[PDB]
């Protein structure tokens, strides 16, 4: 079988806390003796329209920040800002701190989101960083400071902190150094993303998952050149496929015996003819939020 | 809308491995008991019609290797309850959450924590089908992985994984070892019976669409529950129970759309199709979101 699968969330749940400043409460990430959270926790409703964050932060002291782990208050003994993230030094180390790294992910890469409200984990689901640097998440009021991550052995790579919901209902946020993905800004203004494009390497990985799970109606005897495929892909607002991508699809190509450029010819026909009201792995649409690695991990 | 799993940490802290010989599968460690599939005691040559009572007689506490990672928990008692083995161990799990064992109905959803050799790999949501199978993602080594729901820090365990059917769907038991469906734990010929669409979940999804302003499918008509159920069965939809009508109450109150008026709306969609038009940007009616899942996702619920 083959489903969207998230990483087990326990190593991240043990790091979630609530951060309050005035009547603004959101989530923070507690690693060793530091709590990371969105810097807009320091804003009022009047502030959030056009915030001068360096000005707003200098008017704050440690005691303006209430950090709660379960129902235990941690004392803030220092604060700094790094881009759009606030770093609250607390007088207590988190013993549940996992091995971790901060990473900045690339468009097309996937991660798990632990959606949290008032410092309490609510749900876990798998996202991709879209080519326009938005994520198609599920986040409500209070979700800010929720994080996205990957787990490799025992090591959590944090790649996303949640900040914003655009008017189209997609989501924007930062890496854990506080830099936005995409052209977004942490002000209360309606922001549009760039045109979005489909993650071609991922669609191919999902078609290979489909073959592996016995869904083959879309295959054909034909091949294409990489350049000819890319011309059609670009026509349909799909990202270019690189030789690096062809290489990354190698294991799935080997497993199924279907050469990457033969699978490219199948996708070209799907784009040109459509699916004719047929489905692939239950989907009426071509799915582009599984990476090659996600398909191998799940299909071993 | 997304399939969202429950946070898995409270279950991660209960997963162990159970080995007989070179057969390793997952177990659930709650207080001083480990629960696992009873076929951990089988040999390959004897899985066509194993005599579990006579395979278990020949086993003693010292034939079971229970490990939390590489740490052995000594077995001090064993018993079989239906298709589950219960191994009493000499250590109470300090990570035991508040829990219950529940037997779910078809249509109910739950999170699966897929594990291999006691080590959690991934978490996903899924629905018990009306034919008592789940469309899981399970590889060899996943047996003993569990399914659960969380309500206010209480973990309700509802599924333990046992077997893959010929069509690639999965079957298992509750935590009392009773199979969902007509399945048996022997490597024999078993096929799941034809599946149907989970009507109560389609109606929850239509309510979700109305909550989000997508309401072109609402009509001037109503139906009786009996007339609806007879029509639904002609389209391979499950009939509604009184419990289904009751669990749609909150969404009916929120939208102001009576359950039997939504039924009359769905009946028109079944008779006429959607005609190009989508609902929540899907041409397909979704049947794996429960009324709870629609509320859970539209509201702030934490655990
Ligand atoms: Na229909």
Swiss-Prot record, chain A:
Domain annotation Peptidase C30: ranges: 1-300
Residues in the Cytoplasmic compartment per record: 1-300
Cross-link (Glycyl lysine isopeptide (Lys-Gly) (interchain with G-Cter in ubiquitin)): 4, 89
Active site per the UniProt annotation: 40 (for 3cl-pro activity), 144 (nucleophile)
Location of this chain's protein in the cell: Host cytoplasm; Host Golgi apparatus; Host nucleus
Mechanisms controlling activity: Inhibited by pyridone-containing alpha-ketoamides compounds 13a and 13b. In turn, alpha-ketoamide 13b (tert-butyl (1-((S)-1-(((S)-4-(benzylamino)-3,4-dioxo-1-((S)-2-oxopyrrolidin-3-yl)butan-2-yl)amino)-3-cyclopropyl-1-oxopropan-2-yl)-2-oxo-1,2-dihydropyridin-3-yl)carbamate) inhibits SARS-CoV-2 replication in human lung cells. Inhibited ex vivo by michael acceptor inhibitor N3. Inhibited ex vivo by compound 11a and 11b.
Name this polypeptide is given: 3C-like proteinase nsp5
Organism, scientific name: Severe acute respiratory syndrome coronavirus 2 (2019-nCoV)
Segment of the intact protein contained: 3265 to 3564 of 7096
